[PDB]
Design a protein around this ligand. Sequence first.
Ligand code: B12
Ligand code: B12
Ligand SMILES: Cc1cn([C@H]2C[C@H](O)[C@@H](COP(=O)(O)OP(=O)(O)OP(=O)(O)O)O2)c(=O)[nH]c1=O
Ligand SMILES: Cc1cn([C@H]2C[C@H](O)[C@@H](COP(=O)(O)OP(=O)(O)OP(=O)(O)O)O2)c(=O)[nH]c1=O
Ligand SMILES: Nc1nc2c(ncn2[C@@H]2O[C@H](COP(=O)(O)OP(=O)(O)O)[C@@H](O)[C@H]2O)c(=O)[nH]1
Ligand SMILES: Nc1nc2c(ncn2[C@@H]2O[C@H](COP(=O)(O)OP(=O)(O)O)[C@@H](O)[C@H]2O)c(=O)[nH]1
Ligand SMILES: C[C@H]1O[C@@H](n2cnc3c(N)ncnc32)[C@H](O)[C@@H]1O
Ligand SMILES: C[C@H]1O[C@@H](n2cnc3c(N)ncnc32)[C@H](O)[C@@H]1O
Ligand SMILES: [Mg+2]
Ligand SMILES: [Mg+2]
Lengths: 618, 612
Amino acid sequence: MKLSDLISRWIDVEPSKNAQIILRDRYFMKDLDGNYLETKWEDVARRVARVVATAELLNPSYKKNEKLDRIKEWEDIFFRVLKARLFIPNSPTLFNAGLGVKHDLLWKPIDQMTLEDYEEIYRSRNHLHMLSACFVVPVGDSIEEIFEAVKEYALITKVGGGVGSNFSELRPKGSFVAGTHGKASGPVSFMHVFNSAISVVKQGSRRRGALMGILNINHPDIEEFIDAKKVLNFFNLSVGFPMDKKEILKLYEEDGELELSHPRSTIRKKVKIRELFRKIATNAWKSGDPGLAFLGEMNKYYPLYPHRKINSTNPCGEIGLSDYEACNLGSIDVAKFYNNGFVDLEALQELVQIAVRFLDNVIDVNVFPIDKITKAVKESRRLGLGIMGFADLLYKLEIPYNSQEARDFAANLMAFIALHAHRTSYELGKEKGNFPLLEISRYRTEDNFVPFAMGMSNYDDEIREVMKMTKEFRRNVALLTIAPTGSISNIADTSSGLEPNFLLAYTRFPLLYVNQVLREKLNPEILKRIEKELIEKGSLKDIPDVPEKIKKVFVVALDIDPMDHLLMQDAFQRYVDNNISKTINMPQSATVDDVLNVYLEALRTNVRGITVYRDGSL
Amino acid sequence: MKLSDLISRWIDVEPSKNAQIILRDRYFMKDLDGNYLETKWEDVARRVARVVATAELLNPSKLDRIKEWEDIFFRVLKARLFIPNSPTLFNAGLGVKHDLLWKPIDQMTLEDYEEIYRSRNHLHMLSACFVVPVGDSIEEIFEAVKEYALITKVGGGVGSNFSELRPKGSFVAGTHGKASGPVSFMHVFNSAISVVKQGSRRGALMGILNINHPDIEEFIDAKKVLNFFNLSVGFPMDKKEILKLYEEDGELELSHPRSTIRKKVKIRELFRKIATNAWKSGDPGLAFLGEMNKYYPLYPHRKINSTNPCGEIGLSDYEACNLGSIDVAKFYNNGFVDLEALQELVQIAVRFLDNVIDVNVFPIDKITKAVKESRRLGLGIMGFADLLYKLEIPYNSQEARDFAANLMAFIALHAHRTSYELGKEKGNFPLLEISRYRTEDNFVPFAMGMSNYDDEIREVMKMTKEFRRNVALLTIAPTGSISNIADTSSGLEPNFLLAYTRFPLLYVNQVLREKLNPEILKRIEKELIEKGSLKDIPDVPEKIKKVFVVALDIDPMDHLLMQDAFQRYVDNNISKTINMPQSATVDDVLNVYLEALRTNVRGITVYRDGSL
Ligand code: B12
Ligand code: B12
Ligand SMILES: Cc1cn([C@H]2C[C@H](O)[C@@H](COP(=O)(O)OP(=O)(O)OP(=O)(O)O)O2)c(=O)[nH]c1=O
Ligand SMILES: Cc1cn([C@H]2C[C@H](O)[C@@H](COP(=O)(O)OP(=O)(O)OP(=O)(O)O)O2)c(=O)[nH]c1=O
Ligand SMILES: Nc1nc2c(ncn2[C@@H]2O[C@H](COP(=O)(O)OP(=O)(O)O)[C@@H](O)[C@H]2O)c(=O)[nH]1
Ligand SMILES: Nc1nc2c(ncn2[C@@H]2O[C@H](COP(=O)(O)OP(=O)(O)O)[C@@H](O)[C@H]2O)c(=O)[nH]1
Ligand SMILES: C[C@H]1O[C@@H](n2cnc3c(N)ncnc32)[C@H](O)[C@@H]1O
Ligand SMILES: C[C@H]1O[C@@H](n2cnc3c(N)ncnc32)[C@H](O)[C@@H]1O
Ligand SMILES: [Mg+2]
Ligand SMILES: [Mg+2]
């Protein structure tokens, strides 16, 4: 069906009470006095649609004598899609769109807008008008560069972004410092200063996982890094693997040794790569940290490598970024695309096109806190279009999350989105101009470059064809990711990202959720009966008088074994040009050897990173 | 006896084994390979002398002249008559080719000196102490954090007043949130220095919060963490007003311009809070900022907000100070202070310090500007208590305090005189014209009132209206390290002990050795070392007991008044610890604070014996 008619099915479905609570708390805009300027999700949709549509002022293919009509049409489409909650951008977009703008412009009826209204909106965006989820900054091996980075952590966090850094440039603890004949404190000690800095800045104010800290596997302090949180409470930590995944797996299988060294230290040491891995798995087994960041694999698919290089991800790992780049994210709720036993691909393709344009327009009205960021964003125009609602979609389709059927369905779904997002990038590049670095990227300098592995869909040949087309026109260096969508999946009343539902029924602080699809497919008699058990046990698995058919479809995270989590991640990653946020859930009974096996399997698959969490470990 | 003869009696006197340990530890220059470039104290005087005499290149009033100054610098340095703050000893010559810094002087060409001047690197930081502003924004706060790290890297201390930071809980418009407050941000500064060192840092920082800041009470209790900070309470108002409010049992309004947070508190209760904390742990101190500006020649165009970590210098934003001290114990001669020799060395010292500026490389450009615009110097003394010993003058006496004020007045006179000459010879400091030396008749940068020297000083300040090289010239620093180098007592402080064991070689005060009969010392020593004093020890000549007093023999008020005597003739501030007996109460501490408001002291630090 047409997207316009799908919109009609959803646009007047009101957010749940839980959703409305979240909206009131953090998203509805207020004046300096704490009075609400917005009271309904509708208000947010109008404000955000209007600010992002304003980007069309800059569109060189519109004559001035048509800009108003064209801008208005885009506000209209952005508004309807947002109000329907078919696509929602990353939280900072919702928070900060319209900061600096006269309040009598942000919500006025669209039929009353003038060209001058849109220009006033565009001109009055203030320095807090920061619409991206996160960033990566370099940390150079000097007191000067380190405290400059600390300053940037502070500035970025203030306006609401998260930040990642690879700290491997910092020379090992005890290395010679020529200026003082002294000893270097090493990356880990310095990370404590970054943590301390963030402790006094809020947005505010819950800042859990606001930072990413990576140290490479061959750094002389890697063993200390691995043991760091066992404070650094605002960091997520990952071990960086800049070499090819194949080379590290071969080294493990051969029981080889890794040379730990640094180009500005005499500190050198050899460690058994198996012992190192076991130390990593042992810590992950206990606490869930550190994760693994396959940087080499990110660079294999980075269209600007080696001119530019990915050294770090953002805090939740889903985007590998070069220095001073940002996360520009937004997600489609694919559960709203279910139609009588299938996914409405006609409506989905239209929304993919609209969503790419929306995210790309966000760049134009984004205001960054640092000059170098503005430059790096404009030069590559990297986007992060993702999905949520995936687990709920499978519930509707009656497909077990832990099945090859689901993984085949995922790869094909994702290949379809990638195809149409990249085709849109081509179109936008023809319309508005290519990303300035296109001419030096592998889309132009190389034959048959494709920014992901593929190999699991009937769309591959069509994808190859479009990638060839983008040699000539391309708006964006990359377009896709799958984010946690922790807050925005709640606003959308759907399951988060690509993850299975963690629980079918639970109480949060104090109303109880019950999965909506479960309510529609399970006999209302049986439900009222088993609701008690379900909440206590956290699964349908071992409940009598529950049809085997629904037990199979309605699996939760811990019903699904780790390899099925990992293989789902691989199925998606084959058709994503950035990365993916995915927790590999493991049962309490899991061993350190079990964790090692996940790592080894990960190395053979196409994933670009790994996070595991053992139930009960924390 | 004239400076030349005095140098002859000292120039060939080697540093003690004790002092030699300090020098081989961290003063002798090494390769990046770790090898010794310098092995004896004289090798140090050669480098430093030659580098500072390079400044004469800039002298608009030329190879014979530079060499001249290097010689006189060298001789006074080698004889340990005068010594610059440690960073000058550490960092002089950094970046300069080793073939230039030591080779025989008669082998020096003009080519050579110009090369030294050109090749001074970014580590060539020759000053002890800095002050930097911390503005009320995340941007300014973290720019200041970076500044702390950069200054600490090159070997400097740094101080700030954190009063501009709005109080904990205040509104932040940019986030609609709540401010963390000054004390929370100070923790970030502390963490920063935690990972930075010039070789390995106690009291590297000064943190001041003003008495009327709404978080003043949290700040007073801040340390009970911030291990690299010394803390002081700031009094930007006149000492008179606070004494008044205290005597009237008045109330102080706590407020901040960027907060709606405000509060009334009894001023006596705030003082008692301070005293109790000080009584427990020696912090925080009092900084009478208003009194510093009172004598600040550039007030209010520029304004003193903070001191360095030891408090002896009141600095406006981004200023530094290069200190150097004269060992007065070496000027003892036949029951007199050799005013002839001492005078020559003062002129030389002022020139030396003023030259250090020209060859100094600062880590930040706003600092280079501040230093070059005012040319503030900090010339001081060490060996004072040992001088009293030689003069057989009890430290805790009116004779001591009168002698002290006279010594200092004398130094003050000749220092400000030489600043007139150098101002004539090299040009005035750029802000002369807007300073009170020109804009008001009868401005004097200290209180005086304790010497017959005052009248001439009043005249020399007047001639200063036309020619003056430096905005102010004098300080008394702790001289912790340089006094041990000079084998003498530190700063203006009485000796803390007459006998202690350096490991297992014993030491007894070099001068006590001469006045006392060796036979008595052999017996006495045992008890002296356990009691840390001679006042109760049986069969010690009364005149010996009263002359060779140590810090704890001298009561709180006599320490304070000694600080007053010196301060009347110091245009900057003074480092002085007011020691108190272990049996002191919080009330005794309060009385010291109240007395200090009545004297001319610009700051106060107290330490109760055995509190830590
Ligand atoms: C998004 C997210 C995050 C983000 C949240 C910020 C963001 N970028 O959106 C960040 C990066 C903070 C994060 C971190 C971690 N998370 Co998480 N996270 C999620 C996720 C996907 C959504 C949560 C959410 O926003 N819900 C909606 C909001 C509106 O409700 P909320 O009540 O305000 O949510 C808050 C809490 O969930 C909290 N939180 C997030 N993760 C965790 C983990 C633990 C152990 C705790 C106590 C709290 C907590 O942060 C939220 C506010 O930002 C859920 C999965 C799920 N089923 O919900 C997990 C989930 C709670 N996380 C989990 C885990 C294990 C972790 C980590 C231990 C992973 C790691 N590598 O270390 C860390 C813990 C860090 C710490 N200091 O404790 C598990 C915990 C399982 C369990 N049995 O408790 C979950 C269920 C994912 C999973 N599939 O297992 N997470
Ligand atoms: C200079 C100095 C300082 C400097 C040292 C660096 C510098 N500016 O060069 C600073 C600012 C760090 C300082 C601080 C304090 N000091 Co102090 N300091 C001195 C002084 C004048 C010189 C000693 C020295 O360096 N000797 C030569 C060097 C080469 O040998 P050293 O053994 O390596 O010296 C080190 C120790 O003395 C140490 N140190 C300095 N002060 C203190 C205080 C205590 C309690 C301890 C354990 C160590 C210590 O720092 C030196 C190296 O930098 C002496 C007075 C004296 N007559 O010696 C005191 C002295 C040791 N300090 C004293 C006191 C009380 C303090 C403070 C508590 C005061 C305060 N306001 O907080 C603090 C303690 C801070 C802390 N973290 O413990 C008293 C201690 C009395 C006692 N019963 O032990 C002394 C004896 C001075 C006095 N007038 O009473 N001090
Ligand atoms: C100066 C200094 C550096 N470091 C660390 C921070 C950086 O990781 C690293 C380099 O610091 P730098 O600031 O580059 O020190 P430097 O330039 O004087 O010395 P070099 O020529 O050897 O670079 O050493 C400390 O841990 N403590 C210190 O005091
Ligand atoms: C942003 C932020 C500021 N602050 C403090 C730092 C400064 O002391 C003070 C000002 O911060 P600023 O960074 O200057 O805040 P702002 O400009 O966005 O808001 P305003 O106009 O109200 O100044 O608040 C916090 O404590 N936490 C924070 O998260
Ligand atoms: N500073 C900060 N950044 C965050 C936080 N949560 C998320 N981010 C950024 O947003 C990314 C993904 O969060 P996600 O759950 O998908 O976004 P959401 O649904 O808008 O909350 C993280 O990797 C960070 O880059 C936070 O609590 N603090
Ligand atoms: N960073 C730093 N600064 C210091 C240190 N010791 C002294 N200073 C600075 O020098 C001033 C007094 O030092 P002083 O002991 O008189 O000089 P020294 O004998 O040469 O070490 C203090 O106010 C500080 O500003 C130190 O250990 N670290
Ligand atoms: C629960 C959420 O926490 C994020 N998360 C936590 N730690 C890491 C990490 N080290 N690397 C990548 N993502 C992480 C996951 O991406 C997941 O979505
Ligand atoms: C031992 C040395 O410590 C310095 N010192 C320690 N703390 C302070 C302070 N808070 N204010 C001024 N000086 C201080 C004293 O000036 C003394 O000279
Ligand atoms: Mg460097
Ligand atoms: Mg501000």
